[PDB]
Amino acid sequence: ATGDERFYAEHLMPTLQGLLDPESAHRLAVRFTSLGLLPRARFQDSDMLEVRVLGHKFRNPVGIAAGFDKHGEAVDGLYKMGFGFVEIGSVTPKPQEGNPRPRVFRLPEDQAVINRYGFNSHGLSVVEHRLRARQQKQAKLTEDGLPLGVNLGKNKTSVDAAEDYAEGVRVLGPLADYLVVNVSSPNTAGLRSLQGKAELRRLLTKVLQERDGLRRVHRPAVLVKIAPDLTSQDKEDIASVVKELGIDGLIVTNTTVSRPAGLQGALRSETGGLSGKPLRDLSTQTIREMYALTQGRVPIIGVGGVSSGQDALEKIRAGASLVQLYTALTFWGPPVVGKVKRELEALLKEQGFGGVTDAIGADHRR
Numbered sequence: 321a322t323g324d325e326r327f328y329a330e331h332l333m334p335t336l337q338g339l340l341d342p343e344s345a346h347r348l349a350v351r352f353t354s355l356g357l358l359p360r361a362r363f364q365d366s367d368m369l370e371v372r373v374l375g376h377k378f379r380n381p382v383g384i385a386a387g388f389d390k391h392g393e394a395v396d397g398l399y400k401m402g403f404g405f406v407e408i409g410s411v412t413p414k415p416q417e418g419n420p421r422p423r424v425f426r427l428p429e430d431q432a433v434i435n436r437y438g439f440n441s442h443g444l445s446v447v448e449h450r451l452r453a454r455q456q457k458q459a460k461l462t463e464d465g466l467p468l469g470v471n472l473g474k475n476k477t478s479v480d481a482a483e484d485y486a487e488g489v490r491v492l493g494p495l496a497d498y499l500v501v502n503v504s505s506p507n508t509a510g511l512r513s514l515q516g517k518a519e520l521r522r523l524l525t526k527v528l529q530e531r532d533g534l535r536r537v538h539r540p541a542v543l544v545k546i547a548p549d550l551t552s553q554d555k556e557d558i559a560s561v562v563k564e565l566g567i568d569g570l571i572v573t574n575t576t577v578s579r580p581a582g583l584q585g586a587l588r589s590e591t592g593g594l595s596g597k598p599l600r601d602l603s604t605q606t607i608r609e610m611y612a613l614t615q616g617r618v619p620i621i622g623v624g625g626v627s628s629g630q631d632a633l634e635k636i637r638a639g640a641s642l643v644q645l646y647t648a649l650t651f652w653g654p655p656v657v658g659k660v661k662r663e664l665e666a667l668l669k670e671q672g673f674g675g676v677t678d679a680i681g682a683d684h685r686r
Protein backbone atom coordinates (compact mmCIF):
# COMPACT_ATOMS: atom_id res chain seq x y z
CA ALA A 321 0.00 0.00 0.00
CA THR A 322 2.58 2.54 1.06
CA GLY A 323 4.72 1.62 -2.07
CA ASP A 324 2.02 2.86 -4.47
CA GLU A 325 1.18 5.83 -2.18
CA ARG A 326 4.75 7.05 -2.30
CA PHE A 327 5.28 6.45 -6.04
CA TYR A 328 2.00 8.22 -6.94
CA ALA A 329 2.53 11.18 -4.68
CA GLU A 330 6.27 11.75 -5.19
CA HIS A 331 6.63 10.78 -8.90
CA LEU A 332 3.65 9.78 -11.04
CA MET A 333 1.11 12.47 -10.23
CA PRO A 334 3.52 15.42 -10.33
CA THR A 335 4.89 14.09 -13.65
CA LEU A 336 1.43 13.70 -15.25
CA GLN A 337 0.21 17.05 -13.95
CA GLY A 338 3.39 18.68 -15.42
CA LEU A 339 2.51 17.27 -18.86
CA LEU A 340 -1.19 18.20 -18.99
CA ASP A 341 -3.43 21.22 -18.71
CA PRO A 342 -5.60 20.92 -15.57
CA GLU A 343 -8.93 20.31 -17.35
CA SER A 344 -7.23 17.78 -19.71
CA ALA A 345 -5.94 16.03 -16.60
CA HIS A 346 -9.49 15.95 -15.14
CA ARG A 347 -10.95 14.56 -18.38
CA LEU A 348 -8.25 11.85 -18.63
CA ALA A 349 -8.85 10.91 -15.02
CA VAL A 350 -12.55 10.39 -15.66
CA ARG A 351 -11.69 8.21 -18.68
CA PHE A 352 -9.09 6.10 -16.81
CA THR A 353 -11.48 5.66 -13.93
CA SER A 354 -14.40 4.66 -16.19
CA LEU A 355 -12.13 2.01 -17.77
CA GLY A 356 -11.03 0.67 -14.33
CA LEU A 357 -7.37 1.52 -15.14
CA LEU A 358 -6.50 1.90 -11.46
CA PRO A 359 -3.89 0.75 -8.90
CA ARG A 360 -4.95 -2.05 -6.50
CA ALA A 361 -7.08 -0.77 -3.59
CA ARG A 362 -5.33 -3.14 -1.20
CA PHE A 363 -7.16 -1.79 1.89
CA GLN A 364 -9.81 -4.10 3.39
CA ASP A 365 -12.62 -2.11 4.97
CA SER A 366 -13.10 -3.13 8.60
CA ASP A 367 -16.23 -3.11 10.67
CA MET A 368 -14.80 -0.05 12.53
CA LEU A 369 -15.34 2.07 9.41
CA GLU A 370 -18.99 1.18 8.79
CA VAL A 371 -21.55 3.99 9.31
CA ARG A 372 -25.32 3.79 9.26
CA VAL A 373 -26.86 7.13 8.32
CA LEU A 374 -29.39 8.65 5.75
CA GLY A 375 -31.29 5.34 5.69
CA HIS A 376 -28.23 3.43 4.44
CA LYS A 377 -25.11 1.38 5.44
CA PHE A 378 -21.87 2.97 4.28
CA ARG A 379 -19.00 0.40 4.18
CA ASN A 380 -16.55 3.22 4.90
CA PRO A 381 -17.05 6.93 5.53
CA VAL A 382 -14.85 8.29 2.70
CA GLY A 383 -16.66 9.50 -0.42
CA ILE A 384 -15.77 11.24 -3.65
CA ALA A 385 -17.08 14.80 -3.62
CA ALA A 386 -19.19 16.30 -6.38
CA GLY A 387 -17.32 17.79 -9.31
CA PHE A 388 -15.02 14.93 -10.20
CA ASP A 389 -17.71 12.89 -12.01
CA LYS A 390 -20.14 15.61 -13.02
CA HIS A 391 -21.96 13.46 -15.58
CA GLY A 392 -22.03 10.01 -13.90
CA GLU A 393 -19.43 8.47 -16.23
CA ALA A 394 -17.10 6.87 -13.68
CA VAL A 395 -19.25 5.62 -10.82
CA ASP A 396 -18.15 2.00 -10.87
CA GLY A 397 -14.48 2.95 -11.16
CA LEU A 398 -14.85 5.25 -8.16
CA TYR A 399 -16.12 2.37 -6.07
CA LYS A 400 -13.12 0.38 -7.37
CA MET A 401 -10.86 3.07 -5.94
CA GLY A 402 -12.25 2.25 -2.49
CA PHE A 403 -14.68 5.07 -1.87
CA GLY A 404 -17.52 4.10 0.50
CA PHE A 405 -19.95 6.24 -1.46
CA VAL A 406 -20.00 8.20 -4.70
CA GLU A 407 -21.60 11.59 -5.43
CA ILE A 408 -22.07 12.64 -9.06
CA GLY A 409 -22.89 16.06 -10.37
CA SER A 410 -23.73 18.80 -10.25
CA VAL A 411 -26.27 18.00 -12.97
CA THR A 412 -28.34 20.78 -14.53
CA PRO A 413 -31.75 20.29 -16.20
CA LYS A 414 -30.68 21.18 -19.70
CA PRO A 415 -27.18 20.57 -21.05
CA GLN A 416 -24.88 23.53 -20.76
CA GLU A 417 -21.29 24.23 -21.60
CA GLY A 418 -20.14 26.12 -18.54
CA ASN A 419 -17.57 28.90 -18.60
CA PRO A 420 -14.83 29.42 -21.25
CA ARG A 421 -11.48 27.63 -20.89
CA PRO A 422 -9.18 27.86 -19.00
CA ARG A 423 -11.47 27.43 -15.98
CA VAL A 424 -9.37 25.23 -13.63
CA PHE A 425 -6.12 26.36 -12.01
CA ARG A 426 -3.56 24.47 -9.97
CA LEU A 427 -1.91 25.95 -6.87
CA PRO A 428 0.59 23.20 -6.10
CA GLU A 429 2.53 25.31 -3.53
CA ASP A 430 -0.74 25.55 -1.57
CA GLN A 431 -2.02 22.01 -2.24
CA ALA A 432 -5.04 23.80 -3.67
CA VAL A 433 -7.11 24.25 -6.82
CA ILE A 434 -9.28 27.15 -8.02
CA ASN A 435 -12.13 26.29 -10.38
CA ARG A 436 -14.80 28.20 -12.24
CA TYR A 437 -16.33 25.41 -14.33
CA GLY A 438 -19.74 27.05 -14.17
CA PHE A 439 -21.86 23.89 -14.01
CA ASN A 440 -20.77 22.31 -17.30
CA SER A 441 -23.31 19.50 -17.52
CA HIS A 442 -24.54 16.88 -19.91
CA GLY A 443 -27.98 17.54 -18.45
CA LEU A 444 -30.58 15.46 -16.67
CA SER A 445 -31.68 13.31 -19.64
CA VAL A 446 -28.20 12.13 -20.54
CA VAL A 447 -27.33 11.38 -16.93
CA GLU A 448 -30.70 9.64 -16.37
CA HIS A 449 -30.04 7.23 -19.20
CA ARG A 450 -26.45 6.66 -18.01
CA LEU A 451 -27.66 5.74 -14.53
CA ARG A 452 -30.54 3.63 -15.85
CA ALA A 453 -28.01 1.45 -17.73
CA ARG A 454 -26.58 0.37 -14.36
CA GLN A 455 -29.63 0.84 -12.08
CA GLN A 456 -29.79 -2.72 -10.78
CA LYS A 457 -26.02 -2.90 -10.45
CA GLN A 458 -26.34 0.16 -8.22
CA ALA A 459 -29.19 -1.36 -6.21
CA LYS A 460 -26.85 -4.26 -5.35
CA LEU A 461 -23.97 -1.86 -4.53
CA THR A 462 -26.20 0.14 -2.24
CA GLU A 463 -27.42 -3.00 -0.50
CA ASP A 464 -23.76 -4.00 -0.05
CA GLY A 465 -23.00 -0.64 1.65
CA LEU A 466 -21.92 1.53 -1.32
CA PRO A 467 -24.55 4.24 -1.81
CA LEU A 468 -24.92 6.78 -4.64
CA GLY A 469 -25.59 10.47 -4.30
CA VAL A 470 -26.69 12.85 -7.01
CA ASN A 471 -25.98 16.56 -6.80
CA LEU A 472 -28.50 18.84 -8.53
CA GLY A 473 -27.75 22.25 -10.03
CA LYS A 474 -29.60 24.91 -11.98
CA ASN A 475 -29.12 26.22 -15.51
CA LYS A 476 -27.42 29.58 -15.94
CA THR A 477 -30.37 31.07 -17.77
CA SER A 478 -33.17 29.61 -15.59
CA VAL A 479 -35.84 32.06 -14.40
CA ASP A 480 -37.18 29.67 -11.71
CA ALA A 481 -34.43 28.04 -9.60
CA ALA A 482 -36.84 25.95 -7.54
CA GLU A 483 -38.31 24.48 -10.70
CA ASP A 484 -34.83 23.45 -11.92
CA TYR A 485 -34.24 21.63 -8.62
CA ALA A 486 -37.74 20.08 -8.75
CA GLU A 487 -37.01 18.77 -12.25
CA GLY A 488 -33.82 17.19 -10.93
CA VAL A 489 -35.69 15.53 -8.10
CA ARG A 490 -38.22 14.06 -10.50
CA VAL A 491 -35.69 12.84 -13.06
CA LEU A 492 -32.74 11.67 -10.94
CA GLY A 493 -34.34 11.19 -7.53
CA PRO A 494 -35.54 7.72 -8.49
CA LEU A 495 -31.94 6.67 -9.30
CA ALA A 496 -30.30 8.11 -6.17
CA ASP A 497 -29.83 7.17 -2.54
CA TYR A 498 -29.51 10.84 -1.71
CA LEU A 499 -29.93 14.08 -3.55
CA VAL A 500 -28.04 17.32 -2.93
CA VAL A 501 -29.47 20.75 -3.41
CA ASN A 502 -26.43 22.51 -4.28
CA VAL A 503 -27.12 26.10 -3.27
CA SER A 504 -23.37 26.97 -2.81
CA SER A 505 -21.56 27.09 -6.09
CA PRO A 506 -19.38 30.13 -6.27
CA ASN A 507 -19.65 30.14 -10.12
CA THR A 508 -23.33 30.69 -10.96
CA ALA A 509 -24.70 34.23 -10.56
CA GLY A 510 -27.33 34.44 -7.81
CA LEU A 511 -27.01 30.76 -6.70
CA ARG A 512 -25.70 31.38 -3.17
CA SER A 513 -28.54 33.85 -2.45
CA LEU A 514 -30.77 30.73 -2.45
CA GLN A 515 -29.14 30.06 1.00
CA GLY A 516 -31.15 33.03 2.52
CA LYS A 517 -34.24 32.32 4.75
CA ALA A 518 -37.86 32.82 3.30
CA GLU A 519 -36.74 31.88 -0.22
CA LEU A 520 -34.70 28.97 1.13
CA ARG A 521 -37.78 27.66 2.95
CA ARG A 522 -39.93 28.04 -0.19
CA LEU A 523 -37.27 26.29 -2.37
CA LEU A 524 -36.73 23.42 0.03
CA THR A 525 -40.45 22.95 0.65
CA LYS A 526 -40.90 22.46 -3.11
CA VAL A 527 -37.96 20.06 -3.34
CA LEU A 528 -39.25 17.96 -0.43
CA GLN A 529 -42.80 17.86 -1.83
CA GLU A 530 -41.37 16.52 -5.10
CA ARG A 531 -39.25 13.96 -3.28
CA ASP A 532 -42.19 12.83 -1.15
CA GLY A 533 -44.15 12.21 -4.33
CA LEU A 534 -41.78 9.49 -5.51
CA ARG A 535 -42.59 5.84 -4.92
CA ARG A 536 -41.03 4.45 -1.71
CA VAL A 537 -38.20 2.37 -3.26
CA HIS A 538 -37.32 5.43 -5.37
CA ARG A 539 -37.48 8.02 -2.60
CA PRO A 540 -34.01 9.51 -1.78
CA ALA A 541 -32.76 11.44 1.18
CA VAL A 542 -32.39 15.20 0.50
CA LEU A 543 -29.33 17.13 1.67
CA VAL A 544 -28.39 20.80 1.36
CA LYS A 545 -24.80 21.68 0.48
CA ILE A 546 -23.54 24.95 1.85
CA ALA A 547 -20.76 27.31 1.37
CA PRO A 548 -17.88 27.99 3.78
CA ASP A 549 -18.47 31.77 3.31
CA LEU A 550 -21.81 32.18 5.06
CA THR A 551 -22.49 34.80 7.65
CA SER A 552 -23.44 33.75 11.17
CA GLN A 553 -26.99 34.89 10.31
CA ASP A 554 -27.06 32.70 7.21
CA LYS A 555 -25.91 29.64 9.21
CA GLU A 556 -28.53 30.25 11.92
CA ASP A 557 -31.23 30.60 9.23
CA ILE A 558 -30.19 27.43 7.40
CA ALA A 559 -30.18 25.47 10.64
CA SER A 560 -33.66 26.71 11.49
CA VAL A 561 -35.08 25.87 8.05
CA VAL A 562 -33.45 22.42 7.94
CA LYS A 563 -34.93 21.46 11.31
CA GLU A 564 -38.38 22.98 10.47
CA LEU A 565 -38.69 21.11 7.17
CA GLY A 566 -36.99 17.87 8.19
CA ILE A 567 -34.16 18.08 5.61
CA ASP A 568 -32.23 14.85 5.90
CA GLY A 569 -28.69 16.20 6.07
CA LEU A 570 -26.12 18.83 5.19
CA ILE A 571 -22.97 18.75 3.08
CA VAL A 572 -20.44 21.12 4.58
CA THR A 573 -18.72 22.64 2.55
CA ASN A 574 -18.40 23.70 -1.03
CA THR A 575 -15.34 25.70 -2.23
CA THR A 576 -14.54 29.14 -0.85
CA VAL A 577 -14.59 32.48 -2.66
CA SER A 578 -12.27 33.79 0.04
CA ARG A 579 -8.51 33.89 -0.42
CA PRO A 580 -6.94 33.07 2.94
CA ALA A 581 -3.84 35.02 3.77
CA GLY A 582 -0.73 33.08 2.84
CA LEU A 583 -1.61 31.56 -0.52
CA GLN A 584 1.57 31.33 -2.62
CA GLY A 585 0.41 30.05 -5.97
CA ALA A 586 0.84 32.41 -8.88
CA LEU A 587 -2.83 31.82 -9.77
CA ARG A 588 -4.25 32.72 -6.34
CA SER A 589 -6.15 35.73 -7.71
CA GLU A 590 -8.06 33.80 -10.36
CA THR A 591 -11.85 33.97 -10.02
CA GLY A 592 -13.47 30.84 -8.69
CA GLY A 593 -13.85 28.48 -5.80
CA LEU A 594 -10.76 27.50 -3.84
CA SER A 595 -10.43 23.90 -2.64
CA GLY A 596 -7.81 21.77 -0.90
CA LYS A 597 -5.63 22.49 2.11
CA PRO A 598 -6.40 26.23 2.48
CA LEU A 599 -10.10 25.38 2.81
CA ARG A 600 -9.67 22.59 5.33
CA ASP A 601 -10.07 24.33 8.67
CA LEU A 602 -12.68 26.77 7.39
CA SER A 603 -14.73 23.70 6.43
CA THR A 604 -14.12 21.92 9.77
CA GLN A 605 -15.27 24.96 11.70
CA THR A 606 -18.39 25.24 9.54
CA ILE A 607 -19.17 21.59 10.35
CA ARG A 608 -18.65 22.33 14.03
CA GLU A 609 -21.07 25.28 13.93
CA MET A 610 -23.77 23.49 11.92
CA TYR A 611 -23.61 20.44 14.19
CA ALA A 612 -24.15 22.67 17.23
CA LEU A 613 -26.93 24.68 15.61
CA THR A 614 -28.78 21.48 14.70
CA GLN A 615 -28.20 19.80 18.11
CA GLY A 616 -26.37 16.95 16.54
CA ARG A 617 -29.68 15.72 15.04
CA VAL A 618 -28.90 16.38 11.38
CA PRO A 619 -26.31 14.18 9.62
CA ILE A 620 -23.42 16.10 8.10
CA ILE A 621 -21.16 15.05 5.24
CA GLY A 622 -17.90 16.92 5.89
CA VAL A 623 -15.82 18.07 2.92
CA GLY A 624 -12.98 20.47 2.25
CA GLY A 625 -9.27 19.81 2.39
CA VAL A 626 -9.39 16.21 3.48
CA SER A 627 -6.14 14.40 2.65
CA SER A 628 -5.23 12.30 5.73
CA GLY A 629 -6.85 10.30 8.33
CA GLN A 630 -6.24 13.15 10.76
CA ASP A 631 -8.12 15.49 8.46
CA ALA A 632 -11.03 13.04 8.25
CA LEU A 633 -11.13 12.44 12.00
CA GLU A 634 -11.07 16.16 12.77
CA LYS A 635 -14.21 16.57 10.66
CA ILE A 636 -15.88 13.50 12.24
CA ARG A 637 -15.14 14.76 15.73
CA ALA A 638 -16.50 18.16 14.76
CA GLY A 639 -19.78 16.52 13.75
CA ALA A 640 -19.50 14.81 10.36
CA SER A 641 -20.94 11.34 9.94
CA LEU A 642 -19.20 10.90 6.59
CA VAL A 643 -16.47 12.79 4.72
CA GLN A 644 -15.68 13.48 1.08
CA LEU A 645 -12.59 14.52 -0.81
CA TYR A 646 -11.71 15.66 -4.28
CA THR A 647 -8.67 17.97 -4.43
CA ALA A 648 -6.32 15.56 -2.64
CA LEU A 649 -6.88 13.05 -5.47
CA THR A 650 -5.33 15.57 -7.89
CA PHE A 651 -2.06 15.54 -5.92
CA TRP A 652 -1.91 12.02 -4.51
CA GLY A 653 -3.94 10.02 -7.01
CA PRO A 654 -6.09 6.94 -6.29
CA PRO A 655 -3.91 5.59 -3.43
CA VAL A 656 -5.05 8.53 -1.29
CA VAL A 657 -8.33 6.73 -0.60
CA GLY A 658 -6.71 3.76 1.10
CA LYS A 659 -4.26 6.09 2.85
CA VAL A 660 -7.07 8.10 4.43
CA LYS A 661 -8.94 4.96 5.47
CA ARG A 662 -5.86 3.30 6.98
CA GLU A 663 -4.85 6.43 8.86
CA LEU A 664 -8.40 7.00 10.12
CA GLU A 665 -8.71 3.45 11.43
CA ALA A 666 -5.39 3.80 13.24
CA LEU A 667 -6.39 7.09 14.82
CA LEU A 668 -9.77 5.78 15.95
CA LYS A 669 -7.96 2.95 17.80
CA GLU A 670 -5.35 5.35 19.26
CA GLN A 671 -8.07 7.68 20.58
CA GLY A 672 -10.21 4.89 22.11
CA PHE A 673 -13.13 4.93 19.68
CA GLY A 674 -14.83 1.62 18.91
CA GLY A 675 -15.57 2.81 15.38
CA VAL A 676 -16.42 5.89 13.35
CA THR A 677 -19.88 6.12 14.87
CA ASP A 678 -18.48 6.63 18.37
CA ALA A 679 -16.33 9.56 17.17
CA ILE A 680 -19.11 11.54 15.46
CA GLY A 681 -19.41 14.85 17.26
CA ALA A 682 -16.98 13.77 20.03
CA ASP A 683 -15.46 17.27 20.34
CA HIS A 684 -18.83 18.67 21.46
CA ARG A 685 -18.88 16.27 24.42
CA ARG A 686 -15.45 17.45 25.80
Ligand SMILES: CCn1c(CO)nn(-c2cc3c(C(C)C)cn(-c4ccccc4C)c(=O)c3cc2F)c1=O
Nearest residue numbers: 336337342345346348349352353357649650653654
Ligand atom coordinates in the same frame (compact mmCIF):
# COMPACT_ATOMS: atom_id res chain seq x y z
C1 LIG B 1 -9.45 19.57 -10.42
C2 LIG B 1 -9.26 18.95 -11.80
N1 LIG B 1 -8.29 17.88 -11.76
C3 LIG B 1 -6.92 17.98 -11.88
C4 LIG B 1 -6.12 19.24 -12.12
O1 LIG B 1 -6.24 20.14 -11.04
N2 LIG B 1 -6.37 16.80 -11.77
N3 LIG B 1 -7.39 15.89 -11.58
C5 LIG B 1 -7.14 14.54 -11.47
C6 LIG B 1 -6.22 14.00 -12.39
C7 LIG B 1 -5.85 12.66 -12.30
C8 LIG B 1 -4.97 12.01 -13.30
C9 LIG B 1 -4.38 12.82 -14.44
C10 LIG B 1 -3.16 13.59 -13.91
C11 LIG B 1 -3.98 12.01 -15.68
C12 LIG B 1 -4.83 10.67 -13.16
N4 LIG B 1 -5.33 9.90 -12.14
C13 LIG B 1 -4.99 8.53 -12.19
C14 LIG B 1 -3.65 8.16 -12.11
C15 LIG B 1 -3.32 6.81 -12.25
C16 LIG B 1 -4.30 5.87 -12.47
C17 LIG B 1 -5.64 6.26 -12.56
C18 LIG B 1 -5.99 7.58 -12.44
C19 LIG B 1 -7.46 7.97 -12.55
C20 LIG B 1 -6.11 10.45 -11.14
O2 LIG B 1 -6.54 9.75 -10.23
C21 LIG B 1 -6.43 11.84 -11.28
C22 LIG B 1 -7.34 12.41 -10.39
C23 LIG B 1 -7.66 13.72 -10.49
F1 LIG B 1 -8.52 14.26 -9.60
C24 LIG B 1 -8.58 16.57 -11.61
O3 LIG B 1 -9.72 16.05 -11.48
Ligand SMILES: Cc1cc2nc3c(=O)[nH]c(=O)nc-3n(C[C@H](O)[C@H](O)[C@H](O)COP(=O)(O)O)c2cc1C
Nearest residue numbers: 385386387409410435574595596624625645646647
Ligand atom coordinates in the same frame (compact mmCIF):
# COMPACT_ATOMS: atom_id res chain seq x y z
C1 LIG C 1 -12.96 21.05 -10.16
C2 LIG C 1 -14.05 21.08 -9.13
C3 LIG C 1 -15.38 21.05 -9.49
C4 LIG C 1 -16.40 21.03 -8.57
N1 LIG C 1 -17.68 20.97 -8.97
C5 LIG C 1 -18.67 20.84 -8.04
C6 LIG C 1 -20.04 20.65 -8.41
O1 LIG C 1 -20.40 20.49 -9.62
N2 LIG C 1 -20.95 20.57 -7.42
C7 LIG C 1 -20.63 20.70 -6.10
O2 LIG C 1 -21.54 20.63 -5.23
N3 LIG C 1 -19.36 20.84 -5.69
C8 LIG C 1 -18.39 20.90 -6.63
N4 LIG C 1 -17.10 21.04 -6.22
C9 LIG C 1 -16.79 21.16 -4.77
C10 LIG C 1 -16.35 19.85 -4.16
O3 LIG C 1 -17.44 18.94 -4.16
C11 LIG C 1 -15.93 20.06 -2.71
O4 LIG C 1 -17.06 20.58 -2.00
C12 LIG C 1 -14.76 21.02 -2.54
O5 LIG C 1 -13.84 20.94 -3.64
C13 LIG C 1 -13.98 20.80 -1.24
O6 LIG C 1 -13.40 19.49 -1.16
P1 LIG C 1 -11.85 19.26 -1.51
O7 LIG C 1 -11.04 20.32 -0.80
O8 LIG C 1 -11.62 17.85 -1.00
O9 LIG C 1 -11.75 19.34 -3.03
C14 LIG C 1 -16.07 21.05 -7.17
C15 LIG C 1 -14.74 21.10 -6.81
C16 LIG C 1 -13.71 21.11 -7.74
C17 LIG C 1 -12.30 21.15 -7.27
Ligand SMILES: O=C(O)c1cc(=O)[nH]c(=O)[nH]1
Nearest residue numbers: 437438439505507575593
Ligand atom coordinates in the same frame (compact mmCIF):
# COMPACT_ATOMS: atom_id res chain seq x y z
O1 LIG D 1 -19.25 23.94 -11.67
C1 LIG D 1 -18.57 24.61 -10.88
O2 LIG D 1 -17.95 25.67 -11.22
C2 LIG D 1 -18.56 24.31 -9.44
C3 LIG D 1 -19.74 24.00 -8.80
C4 LIG D 1 -19.69 23.89 -7.39
O3 LIG D 1 -20.73 23.69 -6.69
N1 LIG D 1 -18.53 24.15 -6.73
C5 LIG D 1 -17.41 24.47 -7.41
O4 LIG D 1 -16.34 24.68 -6.77
N2 LIG D 1 -17.43 24.58 -8.74
Ligand SMILES: [Cl-]
Nearest residue numbers: 342424425426
Ligand atom coordinates in the same frame (compact mmCIF):
# COMPACT_ATOMS: atom_id res chain seq x y z
CL1 LIG E 1 -2.85 25.52 -13.74
